Amino acid sequence: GSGVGISTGGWVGGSYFTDSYVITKNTRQFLVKIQNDHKYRTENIIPSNAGGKSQRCVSTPWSYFNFNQYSSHFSPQDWQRLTNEYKRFKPRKMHVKIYNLQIKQILSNGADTTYNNDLTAGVHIFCDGEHAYPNATHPWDEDVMPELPYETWYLFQYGYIPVIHELAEMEDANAVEKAIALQIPFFMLENSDHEVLRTGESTEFTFDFDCEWINNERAYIPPGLMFNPKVPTRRAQYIRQHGNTASSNTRIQPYAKPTSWMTGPGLLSAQRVGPAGSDTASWMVVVNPDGTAVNSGMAGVGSGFDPPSGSLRPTDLEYKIQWYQTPEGTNSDGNIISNPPLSMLRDQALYRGNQTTYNLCSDVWMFPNQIWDRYPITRENPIWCKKPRSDKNTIIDPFDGTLAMDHPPGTIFIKMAKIPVPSNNNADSYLNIYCTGQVSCEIVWEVERYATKNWRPERRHTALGLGIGGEENINPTYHVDKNGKYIQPTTWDMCYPIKTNINKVL
Amino acid sequence: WYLFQYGYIPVIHELAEMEDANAVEKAIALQIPFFMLENSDHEVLRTGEST
Amino acid sequence: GSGVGISTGGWVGGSYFTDSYVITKNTRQFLVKIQNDHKYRTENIIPSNAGGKSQRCVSTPWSYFNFNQYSSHFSPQDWQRLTNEYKRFKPRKMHVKIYNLQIKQILSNGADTTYNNDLTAGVHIFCDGEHAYPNATHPWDEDVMPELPYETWYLFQYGYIPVIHELAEMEDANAVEKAIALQIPFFMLENSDHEVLRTGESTEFTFDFDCEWINNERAYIPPGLMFNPKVPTRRAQYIRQHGNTASSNTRIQPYAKPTSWMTGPGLLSAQRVGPAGSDTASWMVVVNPDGTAVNSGMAGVGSGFDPPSGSLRPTDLEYKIQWYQTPEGTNSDGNIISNPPLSMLRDQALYRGNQTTYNLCSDVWMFPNQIWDRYPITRENPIWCKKPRSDKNTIIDPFDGTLAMDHPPGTIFIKMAKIPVPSNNNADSYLNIYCTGQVSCEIVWEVERYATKNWRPERRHTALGLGIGGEENINPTYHVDKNGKYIQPTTWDMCYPIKTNINKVL
């Protein structure tokens, strides 16, 4: 049986650990409301004192679910157990259900507001698994599923950038900007098939990941340091004459053996630019066809490449990934700054011998025989990113540690059905409704146990590294205080990074 | 029959509070467990359903 | 094929972890030499300034293997993984091999000493699995298998106490001490069957443990603290009139609810006695039949009961288990003192209300509804002890955390065969020989994974709690220094105690 008085699902939660795989189960209560007055609009974002930066976006009457982050699928207990007991993991299968939908009418009679049920109202649900439309999600967005299961999950309006604004606008009648503008695409999600659900209906979605592993492995030595210091080498070295010091040809010392392996790539040369309101990055990636007007700075035609560092040790704080732990974080209050994992593949430098000292070269490009580790990711990192479609690319290693995929999990779009109301002159006036429901996400994670011949104990993540916080400062991290506020980790180690624990023999 | 709110004692309070920066009370506090019942599976019923 | 030039085994080592069980494999090189001039002797140990304490022992020409300790079967890596990933463990099956035996003749021509092979010489090997003889081993002995696999393992001479010395000696012709003496048993291990091996032969032994689990579980609250503070109770309390304060009968407060559970037993009343050379313990367990002479103190007829504390928090250092980490430890150099695990079942007290304050009662005897945790054991603890045969006993919970068994693993005894040499007058003169060989021990340990609904991270054992030591103080615990010396843990937490990590809901 099914109907108004029958529920379409139940609450799933918790994790399940085995040797081969882990299953995380999460359910949230979500809220969907009418966005953008049920219409598509193309508006300009022109900031003041932004360094000439401007965007043009199409705002849709649609909102979407975003599952991309680890904190949303793992409790701090489960993340600790994951990074302590397993040497690598990747996502395998993802299953999403949307069910127990309640569509309600909003009645504003005055300062008061009352809520009734529209039992025949419905909600639009569309999953784009083919990535036929512009992608809704970007890594490190505020729009992710909540961390704690009992918070309401408010979806965000969907929108996309149809064009570079600086190249589309036509100033003193530019012919090539005229051609850029005429080609600006426009996407409506009503152009495809999707489900419409009433309150007794539910939907489901499955996705199969095909991924590369995420390794948490500590290198105790660099790749250049692996050799026996007591065995002599037959290699010889020639030192050129320097000033009064005579030239020499000699056998290389046993404790210094030349390595065939080299620092990974990274760009340390540049610095951030301009006021905070601009796009401020040491490296700016622009697209500027020939003939365009482009009256602004390069931030207008370009996107900042951050972090530039790669596996090179950041020289300054400008080169480090840092985020805010809550949406209310501002300035230096609530920000978490990446720190070295103390893996010997993650902090690297090249020095260029000038015949007297060594000097750091800031720009290490891609070179043969380079070896490095991927960025150590905490529980607050996004899981995946969208790899853009292109003819050619180099090795794909996003510097934020996300897994780049040709086909990430499809974005699920949700919308309130427009209920129009009559008017003497036909005008756009609709019934004011919203939907709340329950959404569950089950991801199956493939994992691998570790084995080691190391004699000594290894570093693990412990609760004794956590801090104390809250209203009276009597409660620890990952707990709630007097007022129900959740105490956030204040440092990067409290977020339990990967590649800090389990050693590997190179 | 009016049901009562659920609640539990996570810790001994006197040993969790940290006064003049006690090192062992610091360790008691960092270990205080926290339990949400949403961490598990359970039924959700509407008016026609029963358990 | 088998013979002089064929080896009888190989080196086994390493651990293997699964969900249900763990297998530890260990091999050592051992040395057996002629003990006690091939004869049984009964000698008195009379110390000076010992508080009248004296022992009489029978020294056999036998030595034995002792496998009882955790450090010998687990590397610090394996112990860490055991106590981090598993909520309980017990030993299941034990398998011992003795093989690759080399018997050599010792030739002393002077200051120099040379070593030849006796290929027809043999070695006696006897395992007592029925415990027909006196037990060779006692917990916390120096005689255990070595911790690091590459150290030679020197066996210790076997000996036993046939009688209480003070009650056997007969002074001014005591009639009951006369009867104690005539009954003193005497045990020769030649009274039974055993194997004799030459260099091409080997032997094996199996033992099946039947045990109670060893739980590593942290209680985050006491058993008396589990209740809802906001729910009122219907219990009432009567407070007697105290001085000017009037008598009252009132409802018990919701935040204080009477508990039906009580402090475990322990004896805090007494103090240690006498000089360090005596048997110094707060509690002395004596056997003194009526009529005996007993001219010494009670230490002569009695054995100290240490630690007395039980689950009660030790009031003084006298009540805490402490040991030395190396045989060279002396005074406060090299000693490790037990600390509270910070489990809420391990530090307990009763207070007796006098109608004004509360006062600690030192002696908590066994009482109904007592609940406590067993002693938290580190990697340096002995695994089992011998439970003595008796008609009646109470609950068996050794305060040092060992597993008491009616039939522990049988002791394997080993002896050099006496090779006599001729003499004009038949006299006791023998050929001077010794045996070195390889002994392996494989124990199968049954284990159990943990699962928790706790949200927050839990304490784990990390290498970042270890210290730095050695010759130049550049090397960490559980490592070797410049001179090959193994850096020992200097604190009790560095020994990774159980019951510090995995929480349990009472």
Side-chain angles (χ1 to χ4, degrees), chain A residues 19 75 77 80-81 85 449-450 454-460 462-464 476-479 486 496, chain C residues 19 75 77 80-81 85 449-450 454-460 462-464 476-479 486 496:
Chain A
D19 287 340
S75 63
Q77 183 64 250
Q80 188 187 3
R81 191 176 192 171
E85 298 188 356
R449 296 282 181 188
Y450 68 89
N454 189 29
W455 180 257
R456 298 187 64 253
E458 288 176 347
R459 179 182 180 172
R460 298 289 176 266
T462 183
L464 298 181
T477 302
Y478 297 129
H479 203 281
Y486 182 73
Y496 296 158
Chain C
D19 287 340
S75 63
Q77 183 64 250
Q80 188 187 3
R81 190 176 192 171
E85 298 188 356
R449 296 282 181 188
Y450 68 90
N454 189 28
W455 180 257
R456 298 187 64 253
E458 288 176 347
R459 179 182 180 172
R460 298 289 176 266
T462 183
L464 298 181
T477 301
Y478 297 129
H479 203 281
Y486 182 73
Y496 295 158

Side-chain angles (χ1 to χ4, degrees), chain C residues 59-202:
Chain C
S59 61
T60 67
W62 288 87
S63 60
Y64 60 94
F65 298 93
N66 190 344
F67 298 97
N68 193 30
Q69 184 172 351
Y70 292 101
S71 295
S72 62
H73 298 90
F74 289 96
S75 63
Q77 183 64 250
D78 292 342
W79 182 257
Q80 188 187 3
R81 190 176 192 171
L82 177 68
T83 60
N84 282 337
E85 298 188 356
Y86 297 100
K87 69 178 181 182
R88 56 175 184 177
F89 59 94
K90 62 183 176 181
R92 177 60 67 185
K93 187 180 68 64
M94 179 175 173
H95 187 274
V96 174
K97 293 177 179 177
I98 297 168
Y99 61 92
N100 285 338
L101 299 173
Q102 301 175 343
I103 297 97
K104 292 184 181 300
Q105 184 179 351
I106 300 168
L107 293 60
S108 65
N109 193 32
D112 58 351
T113 301
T114 59
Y115 301 93
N116 288 335
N117 286 283
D118 288 347
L119 297 175
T120 59
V123 64
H124 291 75
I125 293 173
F126 172 71
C127 183
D128 189 8
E130 299 173 351
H131 297 87
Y133 296 91
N135 61 340
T137 63
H138 192 213
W140 298 99
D141 286 346
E142 291 295 326
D143 63 8
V144 188
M145 186 179 182
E147 178 180 0
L148 290 53
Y150 62 91
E151 279 75 354
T152 302
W153 171 218
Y154 298 95
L155 304 177
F156 287 173
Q157 186 178 357
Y158 170 65
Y160 58 86
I161 296 165
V163 66
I164 296 172
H165 180 63
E166 183 68 18
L167 300 179
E169 65 182 346
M170 293 164 286
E171 51 192 343
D172 74 23
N174 195 34
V176 298
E177 285 177 340
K178 180 63 157 59
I180 303 300
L182 297 177
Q183 287 172 326
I184 295 171
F186 175 58
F187 298 95
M188 302 170 184
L189 285 54
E190 292 81 358
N191 198 31
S192 62
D193 297 350
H194 52 274
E195 296 90 359
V196 177
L197 300 181
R198 288 183 178 175
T199 189
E201 295 175 346
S202 63

Side-chain angles (χ1 to χ4, degrees), chain A residues 125-322:
Chain A
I125 293 173
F126 172 71
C127 183
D128 189 8
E130 299 173 351
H131 297 87
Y133 296 91
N135 61 340
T137 63
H138 192 213
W140 298 99
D141 286 346
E142 291 295 326
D143 63 8
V144 188
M145 186 179 182
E147 178 180 0
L148 290 53
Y150 62 91
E151 279 75 354
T152 302
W153 171 218
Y154 298 95
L155 304 177
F156 287 173
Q157 186 178 357
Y158 170 65
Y160 58 86
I161 296 165
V163 66
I164 296 172
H165 180 63
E166 183 68 18
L167 300 179
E169 65 182 346
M170 293 164 286
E171 51 192 343
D172 74 23
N174 195 34
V176 298
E177 285 177 340
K178 180 62 157 59
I180 303 300
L182 297 177
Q183 287 172 326
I184 295 171
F186 175 58
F187 298 94
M188 302 170 184
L189 285 54
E190 292 81 358
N191 198 31
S192 62
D193 296 350
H194 52 274
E195 297 90 359
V196 177
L197 300 181
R198 288 183 178 175
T199 189
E201 295 175 346
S202 63
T203 50
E204 295 179 352
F205 301 99
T206 61
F207 178 78
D208 286 343
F209 292 89
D210 189 6
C211 295
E212 68 180 346
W213 292 92
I214 298 166
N215 300 284
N216 56 339
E217 288 299 324
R218 176 178 177 270
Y220 61 88
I221 56 169
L225 194 59
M226 52 187 280
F227 61 86
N228 190 337
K230 299 293 183 64
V231 176
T233 188
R234 53 186 297 174
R235 292 289 294 278
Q237 57 180 14
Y238 174 75
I239 295 96
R240 187 188 302 174
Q241 182 174 355
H242 186 201
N244 297 132
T245 301
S247 178
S248 66
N249 192 337
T250 186
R251 187 185 296 269
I252 296 173
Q253 293 302 323
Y255 53 86
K257 288 180 178 177
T259 187
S260 63
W261 306 110
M262 180 164 167
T263 299
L267 302 174
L268 298 176
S269 176
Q271 296 85 4
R272 292 185 182 273
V273 173
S278 178
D279 188 356
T280 65
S282 58
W283 292 90
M284 187 63 71
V285 176
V286 314
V287 174
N288 193 344
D290 189 6
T292 58
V294 293
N295 61 32
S296 65
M298 292 298 104
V301 292
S303 180
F305 180 81
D306 186 9
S309 175
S311 293
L312 283 43
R313 60 173 293 179
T315 298
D316 187 6
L317 204 154
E318 289 183 346
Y319 301 133
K320 296 173 181 175
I321 293 171
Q322 57 176 14

Side-chain angles (χ1 to χ4, degrees), chain C residues 488-501:
Chain C
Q488 298 299 324
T490 59
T491 62
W492 181 83
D493 282 343
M494 295 178 187
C495 298
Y496 295 158
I498 67 166
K499 298 174 179 178
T500 56
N501 291 344

